Design an enzyme around this catalytic site. Sequence first.
Site, PDB file in Angstrom:
ATOM      1  CB  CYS A 247      33.038  56.349  38.862  1.00 11.55           C
ATOM      2  SG  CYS A 247      34.320  55.846  39.799  1.00 11.55           S
TER       3      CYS A 247
ATOM      4  NE  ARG B 148      33.328  60.630  37.150  1.00 12.96           N
ATOM      5  CZ  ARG B 148      32.575  60.996  36.783  1.00 12.96           C
ATOM      6  NH1 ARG B 148      32.887  61.802  35.345  1.00 12.96           N
ATOM      7  NH2 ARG B 148      31.504  60.892  37.248  1.00 12.96           N
TER       8      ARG B 148
ATOM      9  CD1 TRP C 227      38.793  53.610  48.557  1.00 13.34           C
ATOM     10  CD2 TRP C 227      40.511  53.126  47.869  1.00 13.34           C
ATOM     11  NE1 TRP C 227      38.918  55.200  47.989  1.00 13.34           N
ATOM     12  CE2 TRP C 227      40.683  55.112  47.816  1.00 13.34           C
ATOM     13  CE3 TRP C 227      41.737  52.984  46.979  1.00 13.34           C
ATOM     14  CZ2 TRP C 227      41.134  55.933  47.482  1.00 13.34           C
ATOM     15  CZ3 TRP C 227      42.606  53.929  46.563  1.00 13.34           C
ATOM     16  CH2 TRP C 227      42.391  55.286  46.580  1.00 13.34           C
TER      17      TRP C 227
ATOM     18  CD  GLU D  44      30.555  51.049  46.423  1.00 12.74           C
ATOM     19  OE1 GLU D  44      30.702  50.065  45.428  1.00 12.74           O
ATOM     20  OE2 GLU D  44      31.852  51.514  46.889  1.00 12.74           O
TER      21      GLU D  44
END
Lengths: 413, 413
Positions: free
Chosen positions: B110, B113, B282, B287
Amino acid sequence: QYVRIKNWGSGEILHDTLHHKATSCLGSIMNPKSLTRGPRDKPTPLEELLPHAIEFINQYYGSFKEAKIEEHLARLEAVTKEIETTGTYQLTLDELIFATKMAWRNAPRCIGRIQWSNLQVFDARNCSTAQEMFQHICRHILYATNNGNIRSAITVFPQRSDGKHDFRLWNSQLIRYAGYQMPDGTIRGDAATLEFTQLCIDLGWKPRYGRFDVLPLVLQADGQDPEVFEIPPDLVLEVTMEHPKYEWFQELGLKWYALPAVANMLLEVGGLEFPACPFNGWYMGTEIGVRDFCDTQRYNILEEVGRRMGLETHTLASLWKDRAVTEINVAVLHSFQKQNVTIMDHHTASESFMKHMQNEYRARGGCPADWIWLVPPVSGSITPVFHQEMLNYVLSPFYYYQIEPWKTHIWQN
Amino acid sequence: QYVRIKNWGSGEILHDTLHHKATSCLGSIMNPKSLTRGPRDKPTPLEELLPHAIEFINQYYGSFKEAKIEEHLARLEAVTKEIETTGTYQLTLDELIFATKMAWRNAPRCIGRIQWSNLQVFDARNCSTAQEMFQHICRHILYATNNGNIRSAITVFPQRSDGKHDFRLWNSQLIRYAGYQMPDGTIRGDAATLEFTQLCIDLGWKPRYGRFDVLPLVLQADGQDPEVFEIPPDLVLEVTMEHPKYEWFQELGLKWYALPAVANMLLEVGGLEFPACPFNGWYMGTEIGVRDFCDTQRYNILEEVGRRMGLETHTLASLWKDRAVTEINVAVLHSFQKQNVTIMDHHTASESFMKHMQNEYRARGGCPADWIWLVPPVSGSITPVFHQEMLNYVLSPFYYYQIEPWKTHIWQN
Ligand code: HEM
Ligand code: HEM
Ligand SMILES: C[C@H](O)[C@H](O)[C@H]1CNc2nc(N)[nH]c(=O)c2N1
Ligand SMILES: C[C@H](O)[C@H](O)[C@H]1CNc2nc(N)[nH]c(=O)c2N1
Ligand SMILES: CCCc1cc(C)cc(N)n1
Ligand SMILES: CCCc1cc(C)cc(N)n1
């Protein structure tokens, strides 16, 4: 058994059995010990050299379509006796040629491996002096360069004997630019070669304080102190950077050498080690346009090209860095192609590597690959290689990193 | 000691000691067993549960600025007795809240973070029926969505008891599109969800054969057969894709859901396991624009957008794929920003993660990171994260993958 590998782009599955022949998780470490073969002060122990030699002789002879058992068994005999009588052994030229291509074939960080079978080998194993290394290096640069029609080559110098007579090139690349710490706080040239540039100055090299000063060859012969040699400018082919639309691109006064040649790696084969074996291939666009020009620790031209493109260089979200880097890559590719200097763009390279990978899996059931290095520095997922699961492993023959010479050298004077 | 980590961009060095607390090289493997916590048919052995529980209680109490030893020792006492008398133990709400953020903090894949400390926790540990899971999921989607002002949240369902009563969401994401194998050979919608879409049809879901059909929630409650539930369209916020210059972009008829919510991961903490704990944050621009839209195994819109831009879509070297993907990313970012839907571009995200990494090294001497996933799918070296050496390791609490439910479920009827 094997390890199942999946390509999520095409959905293809491959079965890796080749890894069985190799030798917490440090993923993105640049220079890990596993990829480094250091110095020695004593000869390779015989109990280690022999099984390694035999394994290579068997690989070599076991590489032919039509087996030649008579010669195979004879070589095993002679190799064993040579090791017994001399403490080491000399490879034949064919074994060396085979070894250099296989090591390249086994290079997990090389995206250009589909060309592995096309390699010119210069045998400099009889080299003795620094001046001679230099002559070979010039012959290499000249052959490889070929007026822009780049040819892949490698020059092999004498193998390590006891570790106190190593032939070494202190340079990281045959042709590279100097880096200067100008007064006004700003670095000039190639910031990556800062520490090395100083070393060249300590050895008497004449600083020319430019942005594209081709550094000198620093050759260590037979374990002796390194000698400085300037590379004859005639041998150093370069490409003027020109954008096919933004005529202001030339106003940047950028250029790059056409020859990517690794100078400091070590070739390991059949228990032998070659601390000096410079090799080259041809450039892939992104090496220059993205890494050399845009890395902040390198030329760092990104913003200047941004401003020039009339982009919002103060708002990241605008994706200005994205727009700029693409034109630079267009510039680089455009320039090389015009001046007839061989070059490959990253998309074509990736497709080529994917093809090579398919071939290698059918041919020998695997292809050692380092995703982190094989995926271009831009257009990641846009390339095939990004969706290909990979297995990174060290085979033999192999190209290892070495500890920087200035850190281990014993200065005679 | 520690492991030296280097950032080649800034030249900074960091010392990783955090890895000491974790638990040949499969580098680019997507779903490795090391990141997967599978099913069980028998309860967690006590000799394993207890030391794991104690370790967590100590981490939790050892997280406060001003220590509360009295309560710490009391909790150790009660936890031990609860395990002794019931075979397992219940976390307090504060421990759960702490556990969910820490697991997020420990998520090596991630890039977002830096937000770890901002997480809404919905306690659904008292949930009993599929209908109830569904109600919680709707409450979640609604809270998180917040009319575009996305809020990070997680909903925790009952923990695994004996492994034969698992609460599971068969979906990979809360909100996702369906994928159809149209007659004419071409796939429609999201090709990634092909096998799942069929499963939903086997369970009676009504196919609407579109390109953006929001799939239904498939909820397994208390180990029972999964029940199909359509998500109330009012809850599903979407963004219409519009390029701020190429007005023909809308003519593509593209859109995407504003809520990225993982639905199938397992939360492990203090020896306990939560097979169902959907969570969201979010979106990061790439992506959608790069992975969802341009992956050939996804929407695969790349060439269509190329042709439309009037580019040489038949010559790779032209770098057309490069030019296109950038406009798509501009479209995506533009659209979300206009319709007031929270979004972060990849450059800003990367800088944010680099900052988070600095903070984590000073705070706890390390930050588990997976370079392969943290480096955006485009503009690789153009981002800070690319030049940052990283150490990937599994801590606890942690978010694990799980074996797909349809592969292990025992169908009652
Ligand atoms: C024929 C054209 C070739 C192409 C396009 C090619 C391309 C590349 C590229 C793009 C890299 C990574 C560059 C970097 O980021 O530093 C690389 C690395 C490498 N290549 Fe190739 N290469 C070629 C030929 C060769 C040859 C002839 C050899 C060896 C005989 C070779 C050995 C390797 C090795 C060992 C590395 C790793 C260097 C390092 O770790 O710093 N390559 N190559
Ligand atoms: C606040 C905004 C957040 C952003 C921008 C963010 C961004 C990302 C991105 C870009 C990915 C990779 C997506 C992919 O390629 O599949 C990801 C993965 C991940 N994130 Fe975050 N995230 C956020 C919040 C969260 C939260 C709240 C959690 C957990 C409570 C979380 C847990 C993870 C995990 C476990 C993964 C890995 C999923 C997988 O392996 O498929 N993220 N996140
Ligand atoms: C830290 C990270 O390993 C480093 O920045 C990388 C990653 N990938 C790379 N890939 C290539 N081809 N060349 C490189 O120099 C690097 N460097
Ligand atoms: C094979 C490879 O692991 C795979 O294609 C990757 C790599 N990096 C990734 N990075 C992110 N963030 N998300 C992904 O899905 C992937 N997939
Ligand atoms: C010298 C920079 C690294 C390198 C090496 C090789 C062999 C090819 C290539 N294209 N780049
Ligand atoms: C659902 C797709 C993966 C994902 C997860 C999270 C938590 C954030 C984010 N931006 N993307």
